[PDB]
Design an enzyme around this catalytic site. Structure first.
Site, PDB file in Angstrom:
ATOM      1  N   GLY A 188       7.189   4.525   3.666  1.00 52.02           N
ATOM      2  CA  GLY A 188       7.753   5.199   4.328  1.00 52.02           C
ATOM      3  C   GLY A 188       9.321   5.047   4.788  1.00 52.02           C
ATOM      4  O   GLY A 188      10.111   4.438   3.993  1.00 52.02           O
TER       5      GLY A 188
ATOM      6  N   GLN B 226      10.777   3.620   7.161  1.00 49.19           N
ATOM      7  CA  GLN B 226      11.074   2.514   7.724  1.00 49.19           C
ATOM      8  C   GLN B 226      11.165   1.180   6.858  1.00 49.19           C
ATOM      9  O   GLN B 226      11.675   0.133   6.954  1.00 49.19           O
ATOM     10  CB  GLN B 226      10.459   1.983   9.165  1.00 49.19           C
ATOM     11  CG  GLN B 226      10.301   3.150  10.185  1.00 49.19           C
ATOM     12  CD  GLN B 226       9.350   2.839  11.086  1.00 49.19           C
ATOM     13  OE1 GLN B 226       8.179   3.197  10.840  1.00 49.19           O
ATOM     14  NE2 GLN B 226       9.696   2.843  12.167  1.00 49.19           N
ATOM     15  N   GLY B 227      10.486   1.618   5.859  1.00 51.98           N
ATOM     16  CA  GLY B 227      10.511   0.659   4.563  1.00 51.98           C
ATOM     17  C   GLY B 227       8.995   0.384   3.926  1.00 51.98           C
ATOM     18  O   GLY B 227       8.469   1.281   3.758  1.00 51.98           O
ATOM     19  N   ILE B 228       8.717  -0.865   3.470  1.00 50.27           N
ATOM     20  CA  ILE B 228       7.541  -0.863   2.865  1.00 50.27           C
ATOM     21  C   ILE B 228       6.560  -1.438   3.776  1.00 50.27           C
ATOM     22  O   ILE B 228       6.901  -1.974   5.200  1.00 50.27           O
ATOM     23  CB  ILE B 228       7.530  -2.023   1.739  1.00 50.27           C
ATOM     24  CG1 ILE B 228       8.583  -1.884   0.802  1.00 50.27           C
ATOM     25  CG2 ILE B 228       6.411  -2.283   0.865  1.00 50.27           C
ATOM     26  CD1 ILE B 228       8.783  -2.672  -0.390  1.00 50.27           C
ATOM     27  N   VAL B 229       5.195  -1.225   3.606  1.00 50.16           N
ATOM     28  CA  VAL B 229       3.898  -1.422   4.428  1.00 50.16           C
ATOM     29  C   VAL B 229       2.847  -2.080   3.469  1.00 50.16           C
ATOM     30  O   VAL B 229       2.467  -1.570   2.590  1.00 50.16           O
ATOM     31  CB  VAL B 229       3.539  -0.122   5.201  1.00 50.16           C
ATOM     32  CG1 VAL B 229       2.072  -0.457   5.715  1.00 50.16           C
ATOM     33  CG2 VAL B 229       4.613   0.558   6.233  1.00 50.16           C
TER      34      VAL B 229
ATOM     35  N   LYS C 145       3.866  -3.338   8.575  1.00 52.92           N
ATOM     36  CA  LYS C 145       4.958  -2.764   8.619  1.00 52.92           C
ATOM     37  C   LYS C 145       6.220  -3.597   8.962  1.00 52.92           C
ATOM     38  O   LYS C 145       6.128  -4.410   9.778  1.00 52.92           O
ATOM     39  CB  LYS C 145       4.889  -1.548   9.476  1.00 52.92           C
ATOM     40  CG  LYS C 145       6.347  -0.604   9.350  1.00 52.92           C
ATOM     41  CD  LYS C 145       6.273   0.790   9.919  1.00 52.92           C
ATOM     42  CE  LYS C 145       5.874   0.981  11.266  1.00 52.92           C
ATOM     43  NZ  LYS C 145       5.669   2.350  11.570  1.00 52.92           N
TER      44      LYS C 145
ATOM     45  N   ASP D 194       7.853  16.082  14.590  1.00 51.43           N
ATOM     46  CA  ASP D 194       8.110  15.781  13.443  1.00 51.43           C
ATOM     47  C   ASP D 194       6.769  15.164  12.545  1.00 51.43           C
ATOM     48  O   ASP D 194       6.684  14.120  11.994  1.00 51.43           O
ATOM     49  CB  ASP D 194       9.053  14.630  13.254  1.00 51.43           C
ATOM     50  CG  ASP D 194       9.745  14.253  11.932  1.00 51.43           C
ATOM     51  OD1 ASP D 194       9.268  15.200  10.903  1.00 51.43           O
ATOM     52  OD2 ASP D 194       9.958  13.199  11.396  1.00 51.43           O
TER      53      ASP D 194
ATOM     54  N   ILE E  86       0.906  -1.416   0.037  1.00 50.24           N
ATOM     55  CA  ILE E  86       0.217   0.047  -0.105  1.00 50.24           C
ATOM     56  C   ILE E  86       0.905   1.206   0.046  1.00 50.24           C
ATOM     57  O   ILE E  86       0.391   2.446  -0.453  1.00 50.24           O
ATOM     58  CB  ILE E  86      -0.909  -0.042   0.880  1.00 50.24           C
ATOM     59  CG1 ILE E  86      -0.376  -0.016   2.259  1.00 50.24           C
ATOM     60  CG2 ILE E  86      -2.032  -1.155   1.090  1.00 50.24           C
ATOM     61  CD1 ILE E  86      -1.114  -0.142   3.780  1.00 50.24           C
ATOM     62  N   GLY E  87       1.984   1.185   0.372  1.00 49.64           N
ATOM     63  CA  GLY E  87       2.792   2.438   0.542  1.00 49.64           C
ATOM     64  C   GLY E  87       4.269   2.280   0.975  1.00 49.64           C
ATOM     65  O   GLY E  87       4.543   1.061   1.548  1.00 49.64           O
TER      66      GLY E  87
HETATM   67  C1  LIG Z   1      -1.051   4.986   1.336  1.00 52.74           C
HETATM   68  O1  LIG Z   1      -1.149   4.075   2.644  1.00 52.74           O
HETATM   69  C2  LIG Z   1      -1.726   4.877   3.789  1.00 52.74           C
HETATM   70  O2  LIG Z   1      -2.062   6.005   3.489  1.00 52.74           O
HETATM   71  C3  LIG Z   1      -1.859   3.850   4.850  1.00 52.74           C
HETATM   72  C4  LIG Z   1      -0.575   3.740   5.757  1.00 52.74           C
HETATM   73  C5  LIG Z   1       0.818   4.013   5.343  1.00 52.74           C
HETATM   74  C6  LIG Z   1       1.426   3.237   4.341  1.00 52.74           C
HETATM   75  C7  LIG Z   1       2.818   3.527   3.834  1.00 52.74           C
HETATM   76  C8  LIG Z   1       3.411   5.170   4.261  1.00 52.74           C
HETATM   77  C9  LIG Z   1       2.318   5.917   4.986  1.00 52.74           C
HETATM   78  C10 LIG Z   1       1.063   5.463   5.514  1.00 52.74           C
HETATM   79  C11 LIG Z   1      -0.733   3.090   6.768  1.00 52.74           C
HETATM   80  C12 LIG Z   1       0.322   2.559   7.514  1.00 52.74           C
HETATM   81  C13 LIG Z   1       0.392   1.889   8.960  1.00 52.74           C
HETATM   82 BR1  LIG Z   1       1.832   1.447   9.968  1.00 52.74          BR
HETATM   83  C14 LIG Z   1      -1.004   1.587   9.352  1.00 52.74           C
HETATM   84  C15 LIG Z   1      -2.129   1.893   8.659  1.00 52.74           C
HETATM   85  C16 LIG Z   1      -2.022   2.496   7.320  1.00 52.74           C
HETATM   86  C17 LIG Z   1      -3.205   2.914   6.429  1.00 52.74           C
HETATM   87  O3  LIG Z   1      -4.261   2.636   6.953  1.00 52.74           O
HETATM   88  N1  LIG Z   1      -3.104   3.612   5.371  1.00 52.74           N
HETATM   89  C18 LIG Z   1      -4.294   3.848   4.230  1.00 52.74           C
HETATM   90  C19 LIG Z   1      -4.443   2.784   3.408  1.00 52.74           C
HETATM   91  C20 LIG Z   1      -5.282   1.307   3.541  1.00 52.74           C
HETATM   92  C21 LIG Z   1      -5.471   0.540   2.590  1.00 52.74           C
HETATM   93  C22 LIG Z   1      -5.172   0.766   1.180  1.00 52.74           C
HETATM   94  N2  LIG Z   1      -5.634  -0.142   0.262  1.00 52.74           N
HETATM   95  C23 LIG Z   1      -5.252  -1.099   0.148  1.00 52.74           C
HETATM   96  O4  LIG Z   1      -5.313  -1.830   1.049  1.00 52.74           O
HETATM   97  C24 LIG Z   1      -5.126  -1.851  -1.192  1.00 52.74           C
HETATM   98  C25 LIG Z   1      -5.427  -3.373  -1.236  1.00 52.74           C
HETATM   99  C26 LIG Z   1      -5.477  -3.837  -2.456  1.00 52.74           C
HETATM  100  O5  LIG Z   1      -4.961  -3.359  -3.669  1.00 52.74           O
HETATM  101  O6  LIG Z   1      -6.043  -5.123  -2.724  1.00 52.74           O
HETATM  102  C27 LIG Z   1      -4.358   2.202   0.779  1.00 52.74           C
HETATM  103  C28 LIG Z   1      -4.033   3.038   2.155  1.00 52.74           C
END
Ligand SMILES: COC(=O)c1c(-c2ccccc2)c2cc(Br)ccc2c(=O)n1Cc1ccc(NC(=O)CCC(=O)O)cc1
EC number: 2.7.11.24
Length: 330
Positions: free
Chosen positions: A28, A30-33, A48, A144, A25-26
């Site tokens: 930061g 610390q790495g991938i999540v 994470k 921060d 999903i994203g």
């Molecule tokens: C963009 O991602 C986000 O904003 C995010 C991050 C995030 C990731 C990395 C860096 C910063 C924040 C997150 C990190 C932690 Br620890 C705990 C919860 C979240 C969260 O709830 N979202 C929302 C989210 C939740 C679900 C999805 N969508 C999916 O899950 C896609 C599934 C699929 O494609 O099948 C996208 C964003």
């Protein structure tokens, strides 16, 4: 085996079996999540992954403190830690930490993109403040805060992801940028920038390097006053006075009415209230900056105020690795 391995980009996520169907999903610092379904709890979660945090003094502290803090803070506006685990079986082989948070629907940064109305917006800032308050009462001042580390849900609830310090510098308060001591409302500064950004949609204070950061601030808010300046270090103060002087624009200049809704007296007054709030958060000199409780009480925000929500040393790598490991076995 208890664990299995899914390939996620350059990463190999090796996780407990309970966590099914992983999707990235994203990313930061610390790495991938990844998002994941959790068969044991029958609900979706975030995983994470932290690779080898012990091998840097900063990441090492961010990781230790956050484990400790995560089970030690419990607020609806602060992300909750559901589970931690490493797939390695001894200290000596220990290498990765996996942290399972709860999961939302989007990033604050995306939510800044939509043409927000005051309902949605006041309510997000209300939550941010409640959460910061809760971190403060805890004894934690974040320093921060930034939007990419804040996540939201469809229903518009909001969690901060991390605990700051105790790349993107666009939101660091001036007292921090200039290393000059701080109180609680150093966090109010960043709420400022995020609030502006929600209105302007551009980042408030871009700027290439750190020197250029400052200069976009004064360009807009104007040069700080002297009683501020006297607080810098002898050397440090000299460096900063050596810019052009600025008066900075008024806040209806900085945030014109075109950017808010204006059909109604309601909309005109709310816009007014937003500008006032901004006017009080985005104040370079903390000694004159609004603080957290006063911001929750502020007319723009208080249609949400709920006392129920409002209230509630260094090491070697080796030592860090142990401390972190030991903490993962709980
Ligand atoms: C963009 O991602 C986000 O904003 C995010 C991050 C995030 C990731 C990395 C860096 C910063 C924040 C997150 C990190 C932690 Br620890 C705990 C919860 C979240 C969260 O709830 N979202 C929302 C989210 C939740 C679900 C999805 N969508 C999916 O899950 C896609 C599934 C699929 O494609 O099948 C996208 C964003």
């Amino acid at each position: 085996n208890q664990f299995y391995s899914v390939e996620v980009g350059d990463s190999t996520f090796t996780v407990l079996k309970r966590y099914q169907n992983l999707k990235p999903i994203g990313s930061g610092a610390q790495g991938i999540v990844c998002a994941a379904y959790d068969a044991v709890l029958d609900r979706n979660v975030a995983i994470k992954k932290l690779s080898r945090p012990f091998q840097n003094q900063t990441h090492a502290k961010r990781a230790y403190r956050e484990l400790v803090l995560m089970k030690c803070v419990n607020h609806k506006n602060i992300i909750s830690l559901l589970n931690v685990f490493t797939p390695q079986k001894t200290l000596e082989e220990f290498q990765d930490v996996y942290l399972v948070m709860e999961l939302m629907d989007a990033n604050l940064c995306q939510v800044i993109q939509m043409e927000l109305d005051h309902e949605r917006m006041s309510y997000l800032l209300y939550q941010m403040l409640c959460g910061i308050k809760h971190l403060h009462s805890a004894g934690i001042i974040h320093r921060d805060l930034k939007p990419s580390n804040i996540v939201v849900k469809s229903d518009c609830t909001l969690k901060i992801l991390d605990f700051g310090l105790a790349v993107t510098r666009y939101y660091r308060a001036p007292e921090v940028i200039l290393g000059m001591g701080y109180k609680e409302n150093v966090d109010i500064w960043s709420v400022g920038c995020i609030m502006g950004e929600m209105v302007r949609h551009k980042i408030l204070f871009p700027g290439r390097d750190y020197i250029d950061q400052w200069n976009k601030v004064i360009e807009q808010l104007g040069t700080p006053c002297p009683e501020f300046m006297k607080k810098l270090q002898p050397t440090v103060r000299n460096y900063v006075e050596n810019r052009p002087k600025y008066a900075g624009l008024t806040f209806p200049k900085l945030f014109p009415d075109s950017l808010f809704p204006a059909d109604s007296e309601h909309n005109k007054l709310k816009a007014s209230q937003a500008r006032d709030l901004l006017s009080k958060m985005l104040v370079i000199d903390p000694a004159k900056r609004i603080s957290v409780d006063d911001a929750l009480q502020h007319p723009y925000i208080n249609v949400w105020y709920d006392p129920a929500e409002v209230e509630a040393r260094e090491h070697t790598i080796e030592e860090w690795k142990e401390l972190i490991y030991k903490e993962v076995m709980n």
